[PDB]
Design an enzyme around this catalytic site. Structure first.
Site, PDB file in Angstrom:
ATOM      1  N   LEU A  33       9.759 -16.693  62.119  1.00 42.28           N
ATOM      2  CA  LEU A  33      10.288 -17.579  63.339  1.00 42.28           C
ATOM      3  C   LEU A  33      10.490 -18.905  62.767  1.00 42.28           C
ATOM      4  O   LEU A  33      11.018 -19.643  63.515  1.00 42.28           O
ATOM      5  CB  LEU A  33       9.354 -17.308  64.377  1.00 42.28           C
ATOM      6  CG  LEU A  33       9.609 -16.088  65.062  1.00 42.28           C
ATOM      7  CD1 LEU A  33       8.398 -15.916  66.103  1.00 42.28           C
ATOM      8  CD2 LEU A  33      10.868 -15.813  65.816  1.00 42.28           C
ATOM      9  N   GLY A  34       9.782 -19.337  61.598  1.00 39.38           N
ATOM     10  CA  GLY A  34      10.038 -20.558  61.141  1.00 39.38           C
ATOM     11  C   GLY A  34       8.782 -21.011  60.222  1.00 39.38           C
ATOM     12  O   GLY A  34       8.161 -20.442  59.917  1.00 39.38           O
ATOM     13  N   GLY A  36       6.583 -24.608  58.780  1.00 41.13           N
ATOM     14  CA  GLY A  36       6.047 -25.925  58.851  1.00 41.13           C
ATOM     15  C   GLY A  36       4.942 -26.223  57.718  1.00 41.13           C
ATOM     16  O   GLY A  36       4.660 -25.450  57.053  1.00 41.13           O
ATOM     17  N   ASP A 154      -0.357 -35.088  68.214  1.00 38.15           N
ATOM     18  CA  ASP A 154       1.064 -34.537  67.689  1.00 38.15           C
ATOM     19  C   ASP A 154       1.699 -34.261  68.492  1.00 38.15           C
ATOM     20  O   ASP A 154       2.331 -32.996  68.110  1.00 38.15           O
ATOM     21  CB  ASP A 154       0.676 -33.917  66.303  1.00 38.15           C
ATOM     22  CG  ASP A 154       1.757 -33.875  65.324  1.00 38.15           C
ATOM     23  OD1 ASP A 154       2.467 -34.847  64.988  1.00 38.15           O
ATOM     24  OD2 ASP A 154       2.201 -32.805  64.986  1.00 38.15           O
TER      25      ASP A 154
HETATM   26  O1  LIG Z   1       0.565 -23.060  66.925  1.00 38.70           O
HETATM   27  C1  LIG Z   1       1.808 -23.592  66.689  1.00 38.70           C
HETATM   28  N1  LIG Z   1       2.417 -24.669  65.952  1.00 38.70           N
HETATM   29  C2  LIG Z   1       3.528 -24.683  65.835  1.00 38.70           C
HETATM   30  N2  LIG Z   1       4.182 -25.577  64.984  1.00 38.70           N
HETATM   31  C3  LIG Z   1       5.552 -25.901  65.547  1.00 38.70           C
HETATM   32  C4  LIG Z   1       6.462 -25.919  64.266  1.00 38.70           C
HETATM   33  C5  LIG Z   1       6.937 -27.313  63.799  1.00 38.70           C
HETATM   34  C6  LIG Z   1       7.711 -26.953  62.433  1.00 38.70           C
HETATM   35  C7  LIG Z   1       7.833 -25.617  62.120  1.00 38.70           C
HETATM   36  S1  LIG Z   1       6.915 -24.601  63.391  1.00 38.70           S
HETATM   37  S2  LIG Z   1       4.329 -23.189  66.280  1.00 38.70           S
HETATM   38  C8  LIG Z   1       2.766 -22.656  67.165  1.00 38.70           C
HETATM   39  C9  LIG Z   1       2.749 -21.294  67.651  1.00 38.70           C
HETATM   40  C10 LIG Z   1       3.631 -20.558  68.060  1.00 38.70           C
HETATM   41  C11 LIG Z   1       3.503 -20.070  69.461  1.00 38.70           C
HETATM   42  C12 LIG Z   1       4.330 -18.896  70.031  1.00 38.70           C
HETATM   43  C13 LIG Z   1       5.732 -18.945  69.517  1.00 38.70           C
HETATM   44  N3  LIG Z   1       6.431 -18.108  69.968  1.00 38.70           N
HETATM   45  C14 LIG Z   1       7.845 -17.957  69.466  1.00 38.70           C
HETATM   46  C15 LIG Z   1       8.203 -18.798  68.301  1.00 38.70           C
HETATM   47  C16 LIG Z   1       7.027 -19.686  67.805  1.00 38.70           C
HETATM   48  C17 LIG Z   1       5.976 -19.787  68.336  1.00 38.70           C
HETATM   49  C18 LIG Z   1       4.913 -20.490  67.673  1.00 38.70           C
END
Ligand SMILES: O=C1N=C(NCc2cccs2)S/C1=C\c1ccc2ncccc2c1
Ligand SMILES: O=C1N=C(NCc2cccs2)S/C1=C\c1ccc2ncccc2c1
Lengths: 341, 341
Positions: A33-34, A36, A154
């Site tokens: 999904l991504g 970081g 943040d």
């Molecule tokens: O606890 C978390 N910290 C994150 N950081 C955001 C980001 C920043 C750059 C890449 S990801 S996402 C995250 C949890 C998280 C929770 C549910 C999700 N549902 C769908 C898609 C992504 C999701 C990401």
């Protein structure tokens, strides 16, 4: 696959996986999904849980990210502890586990971030009614944290996710439902714990942070202001990466920095004769002046509801933390009268 | 301008400037030549030096990068000290200075890196005659370092710059002159100094590094092998970011890791029953097997001159550092007979 570029690349420390792999004989990795600095998030099918689709956050196998993740975990535990029914608007953690050094956290599957939706829509800004709903929820969400002696530190559009980012077309994209949740509690901090000196992502960093005067809940509110603005115009309010420029920008947009703060900061290097040390008639001067303007000039419209927005933003970007709007006050603001009843 | 993405972004610590600015009432910034984790490089006009165009490397205002730059400086000083006429094939430093915390180093203006030329040419590989010349020079350059009790430790195509990257067209780009120089001595290390545990960019990291068995000059030679290969096929030999995968890849391409090394490594976690712990019949197994093959299968041709190249590469990627080809031996290799006379 991408090219490493240094001895210490973001690419390092991740967990190798491929779609179809299972973890703990339970989570089937369906898609990524991504990524970081912390790690990757992957869409999984939970098989000790009905087949439910979850978001698994897999943290790098490195001391700093793993520490942050242990901290993130109990911040999430204390969140479920104070809101069992997930009415609080922070993301819901299902479970967590160490996996050969990689901390793994399971969350309800949400949609695209408020940033990524924007980006994928050519940075065309959210309509005001949508900005209102989003802002409102963001304030509730973070007030909840604030009430329980937390500071996120943040807040940014990438850390605010749409529950469902389904959208309609026109040539332009419009989200069908502006329900959102706040994510990423890796940097979140209780009042009794040690505070890092520097704490936010640049664009959302509060002046008391920049000048190392101490920070607490108010610096979140600053971040929030900067986000609301971004939602309304579609680009960041403070596009800069240098402290002195950043301060130069604030002054131009917001007016002058209070001497109390100038005087008390150990970061005395950015100041001469009691004011910010910054010549407006240099090229650097020319740049700031040409690339930003007083806060109220970004208004798209003259209607009251727009002006009301900017009063809110204006109060959230108060220089002095103690004078800065609290989120309790924020929820009572005129801008939100529609959404309350 | 670009978006910061975390509390600790590469974007932070740089020196603000704009084209036309002067530094030390001497260097006129004309254009930005690139950015790296260390800082930016900018094209300047030197006015205490005839109008000469130079490359100024401006280092971030941060302790680790500034330390590395002080180290880089005297490595360059000791280089000019041992080769006054710049015949050594390492880049020529003109001067250096601290600028409000930013270390600044002035170099002769060169051309695009051997990586960037490749990239800008759709990763179409260099013809063999050009690979020969490039490889040859790279070996001389680094042998010079090796002779004076140095190890570069971060050799890679981005750190090897064409003196002039003018090129001809055909639909394909061909450099007119393969004269090159070696740059970036931030990580360079003398034999008496403290050695960092981990030292190269992933793709060029030598097995003795991965397994923390100690390293010295030989690990450069490994890097060099990996570069020559990249020059010849146009893509990296080890495309991976995980130690175990990386080792899995070596084994497949190069054959098995010597038990001596397996046994002596404190990194015992990647090994079971005396061999690398890696099931070839998993998906991860399937991935490595499907994405790389024994070294000699990358040959474009059957001609001898090609086979000679691969004997060179093959010797440079010897697992055991003491058995690995030295660069003195390298310059005597059959592959280079043309270029010697
Ligand atoms: O606890 C978390 N910290 C994150 N950081 C955001 C980001 C920043 C750059 C890449 S990801 S996402 C995250 C949890 C998280 C929770 C549910 C999700 N549902 C769908 C898609 C992504 C999701 C990401
Ligand atoms: O000492 C150095 N370390 C470098 N690092 C290579 C990079 C890697 C990623 C971005 S730049 S470049 C460099 C010096 C350097 C010297 C002469 C140049 N002439 C033209 C263009 C660039 C130049 C860069």
């Amino acid at each position: 696959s991408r090219r490493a570029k240094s001895v210490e690349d973001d690419a390092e420390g991740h967990l190798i996986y491929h779609v179809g792999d299972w973890l703990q004989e339970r989570y089937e990795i369906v898609s990524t999904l991504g990524e970081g600095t912390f790690g990757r998030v992957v869409q999984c099918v939970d098989h000790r849980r009905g087949g439910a689709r979850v978001a698994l956050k897999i943290i790098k196998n490195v001391e700093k990210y793993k520490e942050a993740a242990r901290l993130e975990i109990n911040v999430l535990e204390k969140i479920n502890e104070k809101d069992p029914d997930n009415k609080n608007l922070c993301v819901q953690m299902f479970d967590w586990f160490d996996y050969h050094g990689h901390m793994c956290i399971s969350f309800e599957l949400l949609g695209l971030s408020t940033f990524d939706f924007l980006k994928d829509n050519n940075y065309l800004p959210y309509p005001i009614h949508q900005v209102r709903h989003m802002a409102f929820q963001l304030c509730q969400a973070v007030k909840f944290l604030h009430d329980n002696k937390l500071t996120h530190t943040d807040l940014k559009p990438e850390n605010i996710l749409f529950v469902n980012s389904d959208y309609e077309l026109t040539d332009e994209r419009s989200v069908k439902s502006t329900a959102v949740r706040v994510v990423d509690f890796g940097s979140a901090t209780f009042d009794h714990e040690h505070h890092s000196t520097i704490v936010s992502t640049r664009h959302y960093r509060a002046p008391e942070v920049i000048l190392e005067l101490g920070w607490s809940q108010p610096c979140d509110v600053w971040s929030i202001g900067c986000i609301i603005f971004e939602y309304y115009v579609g680009f960041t309010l403070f596009q800069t990466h240098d402290n002195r420029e950043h301060l130069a920008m604030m002054e131009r947009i917001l007016g002058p920095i209070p001497s109390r703060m100038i005087r008390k900061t150990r970061k005395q290097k950015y100041f001469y004769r009691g004011r910010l040390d910054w010549d407006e008639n240099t090229s650097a001067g020319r740049y700031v002046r040409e690339n930003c303007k007083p806060l109220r000039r970004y208004l798209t419209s003259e209607a009251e509801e727009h002006h009301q927005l900017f009063d809110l933003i204006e109060s959230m970007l108060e220089y002095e933390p103690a004078k800065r709007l609290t989120l309790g006050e924020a929820l009572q603001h005129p801008f939100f009268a529609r959404l309350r009843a």
